[PDB]
Amino acid sequence: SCPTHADSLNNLANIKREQGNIEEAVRLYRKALEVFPEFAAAHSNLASVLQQQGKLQEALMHYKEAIRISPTFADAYSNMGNTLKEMQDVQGALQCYTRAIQINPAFADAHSNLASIHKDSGNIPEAIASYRTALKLKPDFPDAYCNLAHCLQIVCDWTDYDERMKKLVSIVADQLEKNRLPSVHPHHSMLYPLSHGFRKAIAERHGNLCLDKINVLHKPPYEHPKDLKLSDGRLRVGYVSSDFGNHPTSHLMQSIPGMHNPDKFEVFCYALSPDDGTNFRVKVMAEANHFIDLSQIPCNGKAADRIHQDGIHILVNMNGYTKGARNELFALRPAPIQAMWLGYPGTSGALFMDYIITDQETSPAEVAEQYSEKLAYMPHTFFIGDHANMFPHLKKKAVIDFKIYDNRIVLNGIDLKAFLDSLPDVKIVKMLNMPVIPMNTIAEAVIEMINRGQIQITINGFSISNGLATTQINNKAATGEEVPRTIIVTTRSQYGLPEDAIVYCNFNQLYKIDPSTLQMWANILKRVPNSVLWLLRFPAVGEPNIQQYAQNMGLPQNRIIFSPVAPKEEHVRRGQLADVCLDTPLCNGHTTGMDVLWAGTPMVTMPGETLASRVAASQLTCLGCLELIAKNRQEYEDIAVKLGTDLEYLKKVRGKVWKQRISSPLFNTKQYTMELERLYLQMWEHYAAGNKPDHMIK
């Protein structure tokens, strides 16, 4: 019953923790509490390893105990918050943090923890406030500094940018070396000027976070199959994603599980998230050989068993370090071969991940040392898009001549052709080829609809729809879950674009822009007098800042135009209004890349070192447009300017993209799938041969 005894034991446990040996720390803490139950600090310390071990349930009970004993223990409130957060109970965690700040106004971690909730709710100006307060109180606070840095990144606050960057690197350098988990999140690492070893090292550490969370299950390694006999000659592939729903990942690959060859492959899909109700989820469930809802199985042990139960040869991780991920599954190693694919644009840095699926343009062999996995190359690009299936109404277009431009007033629709046939005076420009309606009563009716901002009209019996009102006319078609059953008008005046301008667009989230990237565009815009840059309020708080920096680089306000975020279908379709897309080189347009290319809009890129800064190039290569790929800032500007001045050249390239998007393999999910199948079987043969994974660069 001795406090002193217990006190010493605590001192010992804290030692055992420092020497990284978690196992033992817990055993000691537990004995310290056995001797003296009313020990606050023991309770607090035992809690946080239980938290580390992912035993939250319990870790919570102990934090609750700690408080009851020491009501002024501000440090325990804060942590209990973190726990409650990690238990999807945001409400109660929020209560802890505020309660902690109220008790100790000066306690800095609370202020940061609070900011972090705000960050996850996507209210950023508040998150920033609270980070600034936290840093004021404790001017040396990595977690807070780094998280702040990321917010400022998202709103395009670029104050002290260069010192901020150097400072980040600086902090990460320290933390990597002091063997402490780094404040920069691997998903963001690509945004800063770190070394590639540094980036791999970060990933590596978050790799080890799962490793500890599963060690405490004490599970025997699994016996993997060694041949295809039990599965009847079929290779059993398992996709594991938290985004079989309305989400980019689905927007890309929803067709693929459907497209596998049933003779040679058996497809298992493992959803990490509950059914959201959308058609994406439905298709995948309808088309995969087996669909397993792992969100019903929170325990990682039983989940992994369930995978191994199913006899999976290749397990595909589509999440990496993104929201809703559960890599503890992969860490448990239920399939002999485990590959990263499509979903996460970076190395896992982890031992339990065998292959990363990519290509030579995105991950050339020089830079194989960036990844911890062996490379598996697809023959063209590893990227892919459902656009062909999702948006068939964009295969063809027709235009109105209102005075021959291809992107001023556009018309798309499944039944466009029959409607043009109803019309008396259509003219047929050659490139397929592009129908042009002349300025008649018809044309005038359409344009007046647009002008008065009316939902829809009827011409010769066909429905003509304002392409700003689609969510009203048909919710499902606007989200991309249905194909639109009318004809849709899209025009520059709808978005306040100047009818006779050169429109450079970039539709990405604004965090992808940095002061360099902006400078380049500034230059381009100066050299092309009839130009405007088209951006998105993503988020809206971002807009003033760009406007600001744009103005200091010497651009009048009216030179940059902001549009609001739109539903998928409208978003893709209005890409047709743009003349050239200008790609962010810090981090490329990924899904967006596909989106803008589908509209027939050429995109200028400047590939860098990081995978994520190379994807766009890789897409353009596959398409067959190397003249759009710049070797440096300088060349980037020139390619843009050439497009923006040389209207003949512009037309040549635009026509190329338009044609190529069909005829190249890029938007070809069937061909894509078959290649993915090749690469699968290669991986298998090799492992069945008795070999540990090596590069599959062919």
Binding site: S116, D120, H206, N246, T322, K323, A325, G343, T471, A566
Partner: peptide, 11 residues
């Protein structure tokens, strides 16, 4: 308005 799903970190 309308917000759309996008990828983001693990928090």
């Amino acid at each position: 308005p309308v917000s759309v799903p996008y990828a983001s970190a693990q928090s």
